[PDB]
Amino acid sequence: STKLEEHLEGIVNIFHQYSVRKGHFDTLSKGELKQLLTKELANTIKNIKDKAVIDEIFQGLDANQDEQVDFQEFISLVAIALKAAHYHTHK
Amino acid sequence: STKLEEHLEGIVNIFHQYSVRKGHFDTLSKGELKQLLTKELANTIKNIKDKAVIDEIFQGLDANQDEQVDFQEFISLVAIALKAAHYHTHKE
Ligand code: NA
Ligand code: NA
Ligand SMILES: [Zn+2]
Ligand SMILES: [Zn+2]
């Protein structure tokens, strides 16, 4: 298992330590996602100098509350944070 | 600084360890990217049962082998790989 594979597993692991808490073990409510993002990306968020980017991380987490967040939807948010984090390494 | 942030940091580091080697420090050749994927995702690849997912990870890489690939293209592959990683934590 490479360092890259350990990071992928690590990201899955973080999703799961939230998703297992309530409801279906493999999804999150939008409320739980929002808590996850606010805490687990707190620095990434502080350092992002274009707030469109913040808004984009949080887009739609205050409506369609009946619809749950699966890992696929989480991957999309990870992709956004991975761009933000790259960019920050060049600041 | 959070554990999640460290994984993002690490993935960026890995990319950089290949992108810096030649020419522009922030892009790599499709050929270099094939080397990265084949080595850094070695076990991920074996565990993938779906040949189509494997072809998707290597899509486009043998044609235009000297074409430059940037971090964003690398993000797309990370996403594919993350889906596979997830799928595989649930293997029985
Ligand atoms: Na859940
Ligand atoms: Na390069
Ligand atoms: Zn899962
Ligand atoms: Zn870079």
Side-chain angles (χ1 to χ4, degrees), chain A residues 1-33 35-48 50-91, chain B residues 1-48 50 52-65 67-92:
Chain A
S1 192
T2 59
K3 284 169 185 165
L4 183 59
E5 300 172 335
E6 282 171 5
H7 292 316
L8 301 186
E9 183 164 350
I11 298 160
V12 176
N13 279 352
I14 287 162
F15 179 91
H16 279 158
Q17 84 201 31
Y18 285 80
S19 65
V20 316
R21 288 183 181 228
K22 317 189 293 191
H24 181 104
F25 69 102
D26 216 23
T27 62
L28 301 172
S29 60
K30 287 211 213 315
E32 288 169 307
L33 185 58
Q35 294 182 320
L36 188 161
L37 300 161
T38 302
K39 177 176 190 191
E40 306 308 341
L41 298 180
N43 298 298
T44 298
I45 289 168
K46 205 167 46 165
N47 285 333
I48 270 149
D50 169 58
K51 158 197 348 174
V53 165
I54 326 214
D55 312 11
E56 158 168 44
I57 320 215
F58 292 84
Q59 158 266 259
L61 314 195
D62 294 6
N64 309 355
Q65 297 292 283
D66 47 337
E67 306 196 43
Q68 306 307 297
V69 180
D70 62 23
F71 187 67
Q72 200 60 47
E73 183 166 18
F74 182 68
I75 289 165
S76 283
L77 303 175
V78 170
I80 295 161
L82 193 59
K83 179 173 183 180
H86 176 249
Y87 188 71
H88 182 258
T89 69
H90 288 286
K91 279 173 191 163
Chain B
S1 158
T2 62
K3 286 172 164 132
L4 183 56
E5 300 169 330
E6 288 176 354
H7 296 306
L8 300 185
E9 276 165 16
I11 296 171
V12 172
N13 181 98
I14 291 149
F15 175 84
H16 281 154
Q17 163 181 148
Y18 287 76
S19 73
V20 299
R21 288 164 159 191
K22 305 205 169 151
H24 294 20
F25 73 61
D26 228 25
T27 67
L28 70 179
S29 80
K30 304 259 211 76
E32 288 166 296
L33 183 55
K34 175 171 167 165
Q35 295 187 333
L36 186 163
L37 292 173
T38 56
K39 191 189 164 178
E40 309 310 339
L41 291 181
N43 293 293
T44 300
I45 277 157
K46 299 193 159 187
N47 295 338
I48 284 168
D50 187 11
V53 176
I54 285 167
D55 296 351
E56 194 187 0
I57 291 169
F58 293 98
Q59 175 61 263
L61 292 194
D62 296 332
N64 313 115
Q65 191 136 56
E67 200 160 307
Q68 293 297 123
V69 193
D70 60 23
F71 191 69
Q72 204 72 52
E73 203 162 343
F74 181 74
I75 290 176
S76 291
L77 296 168
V78 165
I80 288 168
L82 262 170
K83 177 175 183 169
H86 178 252
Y87 185 87
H88 181 72
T89 63
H90 294 296
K91 182 172 162 212
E92 201 127 357

